[PDB]
Amino acid sequence: PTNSANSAIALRLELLGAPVPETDRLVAPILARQRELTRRLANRPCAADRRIQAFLDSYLDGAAAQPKLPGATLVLDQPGLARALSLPVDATSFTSDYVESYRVLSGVLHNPRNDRRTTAGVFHVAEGGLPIPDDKKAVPRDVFARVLAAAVDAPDDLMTLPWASTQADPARCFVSLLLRPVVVPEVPGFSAERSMEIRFIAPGGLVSNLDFVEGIFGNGGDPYLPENDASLAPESWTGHTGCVILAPHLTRLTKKELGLPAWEEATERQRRDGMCWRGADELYNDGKAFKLVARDERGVIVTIIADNYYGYCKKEVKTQISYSANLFGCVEEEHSGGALAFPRYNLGQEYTDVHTPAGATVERVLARNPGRFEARADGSAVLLDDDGRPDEGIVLVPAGAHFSMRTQTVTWDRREASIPLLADRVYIAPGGYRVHAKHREGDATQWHLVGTAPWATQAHKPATVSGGGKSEISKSLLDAFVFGEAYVGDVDADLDAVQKILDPILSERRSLGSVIKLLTPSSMYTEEYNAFLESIPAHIKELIFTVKRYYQPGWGADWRSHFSVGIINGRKGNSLRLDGEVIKVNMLRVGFEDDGAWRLLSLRPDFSPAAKVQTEDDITSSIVAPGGLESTAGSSVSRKFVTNCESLLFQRPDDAIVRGYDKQTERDMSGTGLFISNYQPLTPADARAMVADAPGLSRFTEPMQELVRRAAAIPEAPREETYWTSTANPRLVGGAPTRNPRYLQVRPDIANPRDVALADLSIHLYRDAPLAAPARHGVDVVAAGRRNNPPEPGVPALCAYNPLHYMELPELFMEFISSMTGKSPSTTGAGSEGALTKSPFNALPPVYDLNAALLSYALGGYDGWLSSAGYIGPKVKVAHDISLLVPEIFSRMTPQERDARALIEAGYLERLEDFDHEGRRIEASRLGYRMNAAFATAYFGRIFLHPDVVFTEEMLRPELQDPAIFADSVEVIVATHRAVAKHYVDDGSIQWAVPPLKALLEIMYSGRSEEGWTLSSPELRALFERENILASDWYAERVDAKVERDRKQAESAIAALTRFTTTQGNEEVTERLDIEGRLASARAWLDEVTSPAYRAHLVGTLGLQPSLA
């Protein structure tokens, strides 16, 4: 429906009175009637813009101007219009000084004037509002007023809708969009999802930007309807309203003309910020992109962006969401990744279920879910379609069922039943454990069974600097597999030695896993028996498990003759062969040696990557709920729940420049319907050229080749040329390929909804809860990541960390406050992405974020883990090889096992302590605890086959690589803590930090708290304990501020509902929407928020910053 879209467009422009040039066009002449009954109403702004203008006029009362939001906007009331507006009605390309745009085979492509985001000096904040953070630029209120006035007077080129840009009289208007981005997640017994409202306003030239945000955050509809006025559905809003105005022309204005002072009359701060001029011609922000924010406690945040690169739009929603979170209480916005992981197993050819707990049975499942299943005569059952017919894709089977790839059947007795075992099905037992068949990861011709356990673990990866691998938590481990060989030293000796050990091991009703348990030292084996296991060399065990995996009944004790090594050029070979074919085993790389050689480590032959379902990526909303509720039934401590605010993810495929390497990107970008940016627009001629380069073509994955061939198959041309994009061809900037190629990827839980459905189903069954009930999951483990680097000329050492550190809360928060990186070092230490990595996306005093975060860890009893990315010590490169293992390790440990206290009591974590180096105290105690060789032996044995060679001694103890550098890294850490803490001292923020953080900041800055404490003072450490917080006045003061905010908003809701129900001529809308049924709920709510039961249900939540009540 294309003319469908152009009609919708023509129609709306006509209603706005904008210029215009087929069956539907004729049935709209009663537009021309209502047009002469519209000029009896004056232009009244929507409910959202009314709230925005009220703030702006109050805020700039008696300033140099009180500008007006544009009133004549083309309103994008439906999804899909904005894309259709982005290209000329009659052409496939468009060009302005602001954007080059193209219709491409894979969707739409937009290359903006600037191809990347900046953060240095970009974030500006206006005086007259809440306090400015020390790290931002301070802008006088009069200057803000003038920049806002310039922003609503945009030039004609910029205002020209691309869609009508080729017509005689091109339409020129502001376009605008209502968003309702999520800020408060849903938690079943606890919280309704709530959202703020944002109004995106932009010159018609930049309608691509609206398309951009609408795909990520959804279309909120027509703001002028009371269905979509936020105040009227208070139960689901935060009380807060944001505005974003795109205005790239503002980088032409001078500092003088906006009323900034000359250098001589300027404060030291104004001179630090460049908010003064030595020359009349000095451009504002030196002509570079910026954003200018105004806000205060009233709940309205107004941002102007002087650039149209799509990133800034995304990150301004973020910022505004973060603003709303800070004023709502109880919630946080975070910059974080995450995934819900279910351990998996390679069950071989033959497997009997042994993980259904007694009590769990087909009958009980069926009884708990009336009408969801179709019970079968044999004992199995199948789910029903939403339309009442059975779906054969998912088969519930009895406890103790047996699965056989030899017979291709699932069997059980009760009278033996038997159903087909088929590749396109998933078989699930009554406690939620799944079984399915798949081809081996390296080989489409070999197949085996996979078990998925239902006791998932949800990882959360916050506050992780760039390079730290935030996205890696949810990335797939299967793409990292390397396929190596089974090692043989001397084939006669080794196989003889395998023989001896086999004397029942090759019995077909003894699994591969049990054999591994058999031959792994355990503390419930005779101490003689373990010494025997230690006598078995590493490679002989691997050879046994390999023999086990491939053993056939048919060979019956003459297995030996099926195994060999080749004689390669007269030398006995080192790879075990099965009937002459080299056997292939799965490995992962774990970092690199000093000279850059790969370290490869055999995975266990019963390991399969955990199944992950992404829970977070970049913009995250989170709430902390107390324990003992519906959604926290098994927890004494608070729990954290999350929701991803974005439906599409703005990816930068750095790796896809190399052909064939990034399989996921190449697949996605060969699809359709995508928003694409910073790629080179290619033509069918370019495709024909690339086809004819047969070597180059053959390096693409198949999806991208089909795309190259579709484009090659298109007969030629002018303004209807066909365009396409290639992963190998990012946009040329300065005749070199850009390093910021981009596309909006469909969130992988939305793209693969069967994976979600299966996870949910396993959870319900594991909990014995009905499918009708929601079964929310909260966060189990927090594992942040760090970018570590070796020192270099002009790059400070930051490589003290081993693979995995645990940090108690004070040390954790030094890390979080600092968010340190080797990129952009300061005068005294390292670069900082600011509190929680959110300095570029936080318009408020960062202490509000910090107070909340702290409470979340302490009240939730969450151990702070830190994984290592980049380098471990100066010499060992790791890339993200450890980032990827995190969820696999924690998800295969019980909560009791992975508790930090338990690991310290068993000797699996080792504390770091201060020491002297060249007579200076090195404060290595700030690095917390770290894993040691015993942790590797105890637990990495659940992924890898030789857990003792996984990490070298130098990897576990990076100080052995070079003790000088280790001490240099810790000094860099301490200097960087100081420089960061100084921000809180200079702006007075330190006074608003909660006691444990105030002290922590004081120590970071000067060495001692105000009371004289240091990091090891028991009094300071006691302020971070869960019990002392819950007892404190300051925590009670936050709970009470939250009650008081909620009360005022419930009063502001009652006042808004009434005024509407008693405005002239609103009676028919008032009954249709059951508004007085809402006003009764709003009246019952006010009573509830003031009641004591409500104050008590808030104990164990984050509360609110009292100054913001």
Interface positions with other proteins (CB under 8 A): 357-359, 626-628, 632-636, 894, 896-897, 901-902, 905, 1026-1027, 1030-1031, 1096, 1099-1100
Q: Whole-angstrom Cα distance, residue 737 to residue 730?
A: 5
Site for Co ion in 981-1010 (CB under 5 A): none
**β-sheet bridge partners, residue 294:** 302
Nearer Cβ to other proteins (692/1031): 1031
Strand 237-246 versus strand 300-305 pairing type? parallel
Min CB(780)–other proteins separation in Å: 15
Min CB(323)–Co ion separation in Å: 17
Nearer Cβ to other proteins (157/899): 899
Longest dimension (CA), the chain: 100
Q: Whole-angstrom Cα distance, residue 624 to residue 856?
A: 6
Binding residues for Co ion, rule CB under 5 A, total: 1
Three-state DSSP class for 763?
A: helix
Pick what 618 binds: other proteins, Co ion, none; C-beta below 5 to 8 Å, kind-dependent. Answer: Co ion
CB 102 within 8 A of CB 723: yes
Count of other CB atoms within 10 angstroms of residue 539: 18
Min CB(117)–Co ion separation in Å: 10
Give the contact letters, 597-636, x = binds to Co ion (CB under 5 A), - = no.
Answer: ---------------------x------------------
Min CB(8)–other proteins separation in Å: 54
Three-state DSSP class for 1009?
A: coil
Pick what 626 binds: other proteins, Co ion, none; C-beta below 5 to 8 Å, kind-dependent. Answer: other proteins
Min CB(763)–other proteins separation in Å: 18
From the number of C-beta atoms within 10 Å of its C-beta (0-12, 13-18, 19+), residue 269 rates as: middle
Nearer Cβ to other proteins (714/1030): 1030
Q: Whole-angstrom Cα distance, residue 738 to residue 116?
A: 9
Pick what 896 binds: other proteins, Co ion, none; C-beta below 5 to 8 Å, kind-dependent. Answer: other proteins
Pick what 1006 binds: Co ion, other proteins, none; C-beta below 5 to 8 Å, kind-dependent. Answer: none
Nearer Cβ to other proteins (441/897): 897
Helix, strand, coil percentages in the chain from 3-state DSSP, rounded to 5: 35, 25, 40
Sign of CA dihedral 719, 721, 725, 729: negative
Nearer Cβ to other proteins (265/1027): 1027
> Minimal CA–CA distance to 738: which of 801, 651, 677, 675?
677
Nearer Cβ to Co ion (115/618): 618
CB 1024 within 8 A of CB 813: no
749 lines the binding site for Co ion (CB under 5 A): no
Nearer Cβ to other proteins (894/1062): 894
Pick what 446 binds: Co ion, other proteins, none; C-beta below 5 to 8 Å, kind-dependent. Answer: none
- Write out the H or E segment, with its range, that includes residue 900: helix 900-905
Give the contact letters, 355-394, x = binds to Co ion (CB under 5 A), - = no.
Answer: ----------------------------------------
- The 10 Å CB-count burial string (b at 16+, else e) for 1077-1103 is ebbeebeebbeebeeeebeebbebbbb
**Residue type for 314, please?**
K
**Residue type for 1022, please?**
A
**Residue type for 963, please?**
P
For 1014, which DSSP code? -
Count of other CB atoms within 10 angstroms of residue 671: 15
Name the residue with the smallest CB distance to Co ion.
Answer: 618
Pick what 904 binds: Co ion, other proteins, none; C-beta below 5 to 8 Å, kind-dependent. Answer: none
**β-sheet bridge partners, residue 742:** 677
Nearer Cβ to other proteins (182/1098): 1098
Nearer Cβ to Co ion (466/1006): 466
Nearer Cβ to Co ion (616/618): 618
What angle in degrees, to the nearest 10, is found between the helix axes of 846-860 and 310-328?
60
Nearer Cβ to Co ion (199/314): 314
Count of other CB atoms within 10 angstroms of residue 197: 27
Pick what 628 binds: Co ion, other proteins, none; C-beta below 5 to 8 Å, kind-dependent. Answer: other proteins
Min CB(636)–other proteins separation in Å: 6
Q: Whole-angstrom Cα distance, residue 83 to residue 1026?
A: 51
Min CB(626)–other proteins separation in Å: 7
Pick what 1071 binds: other proteins, Co ion, none; C-beta below 5 to 8 Å, kind-dependent. Answer: none
Pick what 770 binds: Co ion, other proteins, none; C-beta below 5 to 8 Å, kind-dependent. Answer: none
Min CB(836)–Co ion separation in Å: 12
Nearer Cβ to Co ion (135/755): 135
CA atoms within 13 A on the CB side of 883: 31
Min CB(427)–other proteins separation in Å: 22
Question: 212: left (phi > 0), else alpha (psi -120 to 50), else beta?
Answer: alpha
Nearer Cβ to Co ion (840/887): 840
Min CB(335)–Co ion separation in Å: 6
Min CB(372)–other proteins separation in Å: 25
Q: Whole-angstrom Cα distance, residue 591 to residue 943?
A: 16
Q: Whole-angstrom Cα distance, residue 506 to residue 206?
A: 69
Pick what 367 binds: Co ion, other proteins, none; C-beta below 5 to 8 Å, kind-dependent. Answer: none
833 lines the binding site for Co ion (CB under 5 A): no
Pick what 627 binds: Co ion, other proteins, none; C-beta below 5 to 8 Å, kind-dependent. Answer: other proteins
Min CB(638)–other proteins separation in Å: 9
Pick what 1026 binds: Co ion, other proteins, none; C-beta below 5 to 8 Å, kind-dependent. Answer: other proteins
Nearer Cβ to Co ion (606/618): 618
Would you state the torsion angle of the CA atoms of residues 25, 26, 30, 32, taken in this order, to the nearest 10 degrees? Answer: 70
Min CB(623)–other proteins separation in Å: 17
What are the tokens at 554? 């048919």
Count of other CB atoms within 10 angstroms of residue 658: 11
Strand 182-184 versus strand 93-95 pairing type? unpaired
Supply φ then ψ for residue 551, to 5 degrees.
Answer: -50, 135
Pick what 636 binds: Co ion, other proteins, none; C-beta below 5 to 8 Å, kind-dependent. Answer: other proteins
Nearer Cβ to other proteins (631/677): 631
Min CB(277)–other proteins separation in Å: 57
Min CB(375)–other proteins separation in Å: 25
Nearer Cβ to Co ion (339/936): 339
Nearer Cβ to other proteins (121/627): 627
Pick what 634 binds: other proteins, Co ion, none; C-beta below 5 to 8 Å, kind-dependent. Answer: other proteins
Pick what 1090 binds: other proteins, Co ion, none; C-beta below 5 to 8 Å, kind-dependent. Answer: none
Q: Whole-angstrom Cα distance, residue 216 to residue 745?
A: 10
Q: Whole-angstrom Cα distance, residue 671 to residue 678?
A: 17
Q: Whole-angstrom Cα distance, residue 699 to residue 686?
A: 17
Question: 199: left (phi > 0), else alpha (psi -120 to 50), else beta?
Answer: beta
Pick what 359 binds: Co ion, other proteins, none; C-beta below 5 to 8 Å, kind-dependent. Answer: other proteins
Min CB(618)–Co ion separation in Å: 5
Min CB(635)–other proteins separation in Å: 6
**Residue type for 205, please?**
G
CB 856 within 8 A of CB 624: yes
**β-sheet bridge partners, residue 611:** 342
What are the tokens at 577? 């062969």
Positions in the binding site for Co ion (CB under 5 A): 618
